[PDB]
Design a protein around this ligand. Structure first.
Ligand SMILES: [Zn+2]
Ligand SMILES: [Zn+2]
Lengths: 280, 280
């Protein structure tokens, strides 16, 4: 009965419940969800990302989505076209959004790798994020970040980070992002902090792109941080950090629910729709 | 800004650091998670819960896993001799844990329907929520409930639920369940308020089993609420409410992002391993 703002609470309780449940529609094996943007103008782009876009529609192993960054800054010539193509826009965003929601940290990590590598390329070849220019990868970047942090909290963090205050910051940042409403305070708290440790740097790596997309309502130190992070970023980093963190702790901690919560928190990597490229 | 507990702020602003990142392992495609529980001893069961079990090893469509409440009422002492088997425990709990952990609201709704129907049955034959007496479906009940609500938080609830009071309840209850282990506070809150709307009744339906497993720590209203909710529930209620909220909303809310979040959060129902039965 610590209730801000409600009006009618029960005075008995009576209590009853039957009327509102639709018991007459019978079984329901599928929920009547709105239609997807299945409509694809089916634009054929050139000259040979055909297999790369078809890979952006499959769920192969990550081992089948490799590109060395040499190719990325090379084929950027019209990869920027495909991503900014006014055709097929909300479709890929929807596809990539529906997978980012669910789930498994391995998948979301690879997504961050791709979106970090892409953004580092599109600032290398000139051009910062307008307010706001249309672009598939960066438009889903915020969805990737939130879903990453949220599926991240399902780790036994009290066990993985056997550190005093590191765990405190990580817990608060993961909290701030997980409530959705408060990102500017999550990504600006990251900034006036030490980042010697791994886990906080891993979160800062994730909040790079969305920290940049919001670089107007944030602190002064934040912009310096995320621009530095994107500048000195390299591919395979986020997966490296995440991997070595889980590797070492579970090389030691042979608990039960810790190994379980970890095993659950990162599902298989097979699920990729719609992942275009895994950078290396 | 305000930082309660920390040891070293930064005035200096050092960089980067690059040594903390293990840049020498190279390429990572599968994170090195601990081993999965070993299945394949199997229990030599027998007509005909094998067919039921085998449905727990496959990602079939919901309709292919259907069952009638009259059947699982008949098939009880048999089915109970499996879910309470000495062997193959943490395996099936892991399968269910990881699936609900990734899966979307449709998958989790099926799990909820199953576990509620199962608890109804084992109660109907004198059983009770022992702690612990090893019931696969009731162990996973916490993970299902949590993950359901954590993903329920993806919908544009400000657009799905009109009156600010019902919405406010849904938002706070979701905040408690999803964020932290403040579960008992949530069950108390559901216990206070009259549930004559589909949002609160749906969530309360989800939390019945974890509430009934926390019967000692929960307020009087909570104990009576979840007792009655467990007795008067009849299969389909959860999906029926979930569906009918979506259906009746998006039949007049053609908002691009509201339907986008709804599509992303629901997710396909083909993923359900291991879902033993979908009750009717
Ligand atoms: Zn551990
Ligand atoms: Zn709406």
């Amino acid at each position: 009965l610590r209730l801000p703002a409600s009006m009618i609470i029960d005075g008995e309780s009576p209590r009853f419940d039957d009327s509102i449940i639709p018991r007459h529609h019978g079984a329901c094996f599928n929920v009547f969800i709105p239609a997807p943007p299945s409509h694809v103008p089916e634009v054929f782009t050139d000259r040979d990302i055909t297999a790369l876009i078809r890979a952006g529609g499959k769920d192969d192993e990550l081992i089948n989505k490799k590109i060395s960054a040499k190719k990325i800054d090379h084929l950027h010539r019209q990869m920027l076209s495909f991503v900014t193509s006014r055709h097929n826009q909300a479709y890929w965003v929807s596809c990539r959004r529906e997978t980012a929601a669910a789930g498994g940290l391995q998948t979301l990590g690879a997504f961050v790798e791709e979106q970090m590598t892409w953004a580092q390329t599109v600032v290398r070849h000139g051009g910062w994020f307008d307010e706001k220019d249309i672009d598939i990868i960066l438009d889903t970047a915020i969805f990737v970040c939130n879903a990453f942090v949220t599926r991240f909290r399902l780790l036994h963090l009290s066990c993985v980070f056997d550190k005093q205050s590191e765990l405190a910051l990580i817990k608060q940042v993961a909290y701030l992002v997980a409530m959705g409403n408060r990102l500017v305070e999550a990504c600006n708290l990251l900034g006036e902090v030490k980042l010697n440790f791994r886990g906080g740097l891993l979160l800062a790596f994730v909040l790079t792109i969305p920290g940049m997309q919001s670089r107007r309502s944030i602190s002064a130190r934040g912009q310096e941080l995320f621009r530095t992070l994107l500048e000195y970023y390299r591919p395979g980093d986020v997966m490296g950090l995440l991997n070595v963190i889980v590797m070492e702790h579970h090389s030691l901690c042979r608990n039960s629910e810790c190994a379980a919560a970890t095993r659950a928190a990162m599902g298989s990597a097979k699920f990729n729709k719609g992942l275009f490229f895994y950078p290396l």
